[PDB]
Amino acid sequence: MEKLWLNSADSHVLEPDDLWERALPAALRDRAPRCVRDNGRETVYVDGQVVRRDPLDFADAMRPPGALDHHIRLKDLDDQGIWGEVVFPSRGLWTAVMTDPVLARECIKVYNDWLKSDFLSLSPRLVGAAMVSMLDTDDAVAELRRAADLGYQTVFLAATPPPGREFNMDVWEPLWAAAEEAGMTVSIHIGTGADTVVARGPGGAVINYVETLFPAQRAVAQLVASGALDRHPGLRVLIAEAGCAWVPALADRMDEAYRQHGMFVRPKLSMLPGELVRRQVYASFQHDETAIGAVTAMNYTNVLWGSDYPHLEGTFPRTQEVVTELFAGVDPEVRDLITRRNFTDLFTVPALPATV
Amino acid sequence: MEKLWLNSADSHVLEPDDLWERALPAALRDRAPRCVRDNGRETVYVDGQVVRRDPLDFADAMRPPGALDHHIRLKDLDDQGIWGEVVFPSRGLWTAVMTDPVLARECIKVYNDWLKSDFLSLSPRLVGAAMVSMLDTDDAVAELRRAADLGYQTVFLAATPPPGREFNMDVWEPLWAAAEEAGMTVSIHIGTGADTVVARGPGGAVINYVETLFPAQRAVAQLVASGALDRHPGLRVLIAEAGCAWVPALADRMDEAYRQHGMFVRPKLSMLPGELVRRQVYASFQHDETAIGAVTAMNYTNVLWGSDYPHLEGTFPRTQEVVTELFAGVDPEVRDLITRRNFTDLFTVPALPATV
Numbered sequence: 001m002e003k004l005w006l007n008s009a010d011s012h013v014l015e016p017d018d019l020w021e022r023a024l025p026a027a028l029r030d031r032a033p034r035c036v037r038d039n040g041r042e043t044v045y046v047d048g049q050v051v052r053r054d055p056l057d058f059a060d061a062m063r064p065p066g067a068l069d070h071h072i073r074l075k076d077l078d079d080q081g082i083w084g085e086v087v088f089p090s091r092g093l094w095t096a097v098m099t100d101p102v103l104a105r106e107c108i109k110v111y112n113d114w115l116k117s118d119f120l121s122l123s124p125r126l127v128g129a130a131m132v133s134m135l136d137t138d139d140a141v142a143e144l145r146r147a148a149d150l151g152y153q154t155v156f157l158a159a160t161p162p163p164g165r166e167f168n169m170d171v172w173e174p175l176w177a178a179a180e181e182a183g184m185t186v187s188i189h190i191g192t193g194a195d196t197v198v199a200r201g202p203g204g205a206v207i208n209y210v211e212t213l214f215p216a217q218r219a220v221a222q223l224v225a226s227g228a229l230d231r232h233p234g235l236r237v238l239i240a241e242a243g244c245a246w247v248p249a250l251a252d253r254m255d256e257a258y259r260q261h262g263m264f265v266r267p268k269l270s271m272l273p274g275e276l277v278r279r280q281v282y283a284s285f286q287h288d289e290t291a292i293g294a295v296t297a298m299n300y301t302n303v304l305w306g307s308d309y310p311h312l313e314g315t316f317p318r319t320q321e322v323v324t325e326l327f328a329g330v331d332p333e334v335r336d337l338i339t340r341r342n343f344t345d346l347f348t349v350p351a352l353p354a355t356v
Numbered sequence: 357m358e359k360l361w362l363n364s365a366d367s368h369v370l371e372p373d374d375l376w377e378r379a380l381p382a383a384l385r386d387r388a389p390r391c392v393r394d395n396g397r398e399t400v401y402v403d404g405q406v407v408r409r410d411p412l413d414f415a416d417a418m419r420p421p422g423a424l425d426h427h428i429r430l431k432d433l434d435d436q437g438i439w440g441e442v443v444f445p446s447r448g449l450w451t452a453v454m455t456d457p458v459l460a461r462e463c464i465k466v467y468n469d470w471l472k473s474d475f476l477s478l479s480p481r482l483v484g485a486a487m488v489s490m491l492d493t494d495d496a497v498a499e500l501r502r503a504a505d506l507g508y509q510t511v512f513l514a515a516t517p518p519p520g521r522e523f524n525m526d527v528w529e530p531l532w533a534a535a536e537e538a539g540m541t542v543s544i545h546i547g548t549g550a551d552t553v554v555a556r557g558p559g560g561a562v563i564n565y566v567e568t569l570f571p572a573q574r575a576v577a578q579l580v581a582s583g584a585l586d587r588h589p590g591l592r593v594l595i596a597e598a599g600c601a602w603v604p605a606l607a608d609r610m611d612e613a614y615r616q617h618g619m620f621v622r623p624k625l626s627m628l629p630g631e632l633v634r635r636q637v638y639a640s641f642q643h644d645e646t647a648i649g650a651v652t653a654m655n656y657t658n659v660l661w662g663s664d665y666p667h668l669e670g671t672f673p674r675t676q677e678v679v680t681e682l683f684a685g686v687d688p689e690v691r692d693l694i695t696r697r698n699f700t701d702l703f704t705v706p707a708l709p710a711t712v
């Protein structure tokens with residue numbers, strides 16, 4: 001009771017520099033994501049493409065020792081008063097901008113085996129997101145099925161899929177089925193599948209942070225409007241790291257178009273966009289007070305807190321100071337929904353007593 | 357079963373077919389916007405370009421008489437219970453996709469002259485939005501000042517500005533300064549400027565209605581992050597026809613970036629993005645319940661209601677029934693703020709006679 005015990009729907013693991021070096025067949029090794037550290041600069045390379053350049057200050061700001069040592073991660077969880085934590089890739093996210101299905105498939109296979117055998121094995125508190133090919137449905141289905149057998153509870157998809165593979169297209173249907181069948185949550189994490197540095201004028205850093213929402217919103221719109229959620233009532237989707245309050249907003253906007261633009265709408269839905277969102281679309285946030293508002297005043301109950309451990313955008317190391325001010329004066333049942341119960345609906349971890 | 361007086365922050369006027377033909381030199385008059393309704397299709401010509409080619413339901417997408425007859429429209433106000441109403445262009449919006457600064461400047465003049473002479477003359481319950489050039493700053497300032505001497509209260513800007521004229525750019529500063537001086541509200545209406553992203557697959561109607569939000573969210577982010585509003589505390593902005601609940605969501609999103617990515621953030625603001633949003637950014641809606649949650653639960657008081665007469669996505673003929681459903685068991689001080697007082701803070705109309 002001397003801490004508020006949280007479940008985090010969002011965090012990242014830094015992969016071993018040599019993950020793909022050691023594990024891939026030799027024909028693919030050089031093409032895997034690798035990095036050069038020189039001057040103040042870390043340049044990431046993927047399959048003959050510079051994909052990212054950061055200064056070492058910011059690169060290493062996201063690299064506290066818990067981001068590397070999984071034994072320190074757990075000590076940081078305890079320290080933050082965090083129990084459950086979903087873990088998303090860092091380096092493996094660049095699989096989502098690969099143009100070669102074979103390279104992407106094999107890199108993903110390597111990541112999924114490492115994450116389960118060398119990280120998730122340390123504690124049942126850690127729930128892992130398995131990657132699945134953004135490029136080929138048969139590769140993604142095969143990997144999700146293989147990941148389920150291994151006991152994975154959720155797959156990661158990039159917010160921006162490859163060209164012609166928008167989330168409303170038929171190509172995704174076999175994956176939505178497999179995911180529904182397997183009981184498996186689809187986690188779409190923002191800032192992935194495309195270049196995140198879109199704006200370069202005055203206000204660039206705030207503009208770009210905003211630009212990452214558009215694919216998230218687009219993704220919900222494509223999954224609702226296409227009927228994908230409607231055909232798969234068991235399929236539940238987590239928009240991770242997008243904030244929350246835009247989700248009921250978008251529920252209203254798709255309802256207006258469904259009702260007033262009825263005559264141009266294809267396909268028809270068994271219920272309204274708003275109902276599909278409120279049933280099956282979850283979303284995570286770190287600091288956003290609007291996230292409570294969406295629950296109390298907009299009937300959007302699918303809100304989950306996340307540390308985004310250990311990015312700057314996240315709460316670490318001030319998790320307790322942050323959640324304490326957010327939920328200062330807030331109904332205990334809503335603090336519990338947002339911080340604990342929505343998590344345990346999506347993900348299985350050992351149950352804290354809700355009594356303590 | 358009694359009605360209630362509302363102000364409306366969004367509606368449109370259909371300009372005369374011959375509007376620019378009759379008023380422009382030879383070098384010009386053939387290149388101004390031409391709508392053509394024929395064979396179940398709506399086609400729009402601008403400066404040699406087909407800028408739209410949309411299907412029409414010759415059955416269930418039929419236009420209200422009052423769009424086609426400006427005296428049937430004022431009857432439609434009285435019937436719908438609407439006192440003040442902001443009026444935006446229809447065909448005139450096409451000046452914002454124009455590439456020729458001369459065609460744009462001169463069409464804007466023809467429009468601002470006509471709308472005052474022949475439409476706003478009908479009733480001072482009408483608040484006209486004057487167009488100003490999206491292409492040249494000197495020409496945008498000229499026409500704003502001219503429109504102000506003419507008594508215009510607000511200038512229309514397109515959501516998507518021309519390439520290289522993003523709203524974070526220094527090219528707009530003269531126009532912001534002039535808008536503040538003039539005491540003129542800046543109204544950014546959505547679904548205007550060069551068509552950004554058209555979706556083509558399943559759910560296209562619903563996806564395309566969501567797509568038009570992104571230019572608006574982007575526009576607010578550009579104006580907040582760039583210091584435009586911070587440097588101009590008397591400049592006010594209305595986002596017309598985008599809904600509302602995403603605005604506090606975007607305040608939070610921008611505060612997370614401002615606080616957690618302070619090192620990347622240029623320029624600095626005198627107060628947080630969310631403060632500038634809550635102080636200077638207004639947003640309109642027609643049907644969206646979340647618009648009330650934004651006021652009651654997210655401390656966003658800059659919500660206005662609009663009819664969006666005569667568009668399908670508007671409330672006609674059910675304005676009163678819609679507004680009755682929305683405000684059922686809602687503090688009438690909030691009904692008053694959203695339906696009347698925000699309107700009278702932005703706009704001047706004749707005093708509404710008291711009832712009982």
Ligand SMILES: C=C1C[C@]23CC[C@H]1C[C@H]2[C@]1(C)CCC[C@@](C)(C(=O)SCCNC(=O)CCNC(=O)[C@H](O)C(C)(C)COP(=O)(O)O)[C@H]1C[C@H]3O
Binds near residue numbers: 090191196209212617
């Ligand atoms: C492990 C990673 C994954 C990922 C990409 C590389 C790293 C890390 C994160 C990060 C990126 C982590 C911040 C969250 C998130 C979701 C974003 O995308 S936030 C948007 C990007 N923000 C930034 O790059 C930092 C702010 N800086 C900028 O915006 C620009 O560098 C500039 C300030 C405009 C300078 O340009 P210039 O005008 O001076 O020429 C992720 C995406 C994720 O895929």
Ligand SMILES: [Mn+2]
Binds near residue numbers: 010240241308
């Ligand atoms: Mn994250």
Ligand SMILES: [Mn+2]
Binds near residue numbers: 241308311313314
């Ligand atoms: Mn992050």
Ligand SMILES: [Mn+2]
Binds near residue numbers: 394
């Ligand atoms: Mn004909």
Ligand SMILES: [Mn+2]
Binds near residue numbers: 366367596597664
């Ligand atoms: Mn409108």
Ligand SMILES: [Mn+2]
Binds near residue numbers: 597
């Ligand atoms: Mn409209």
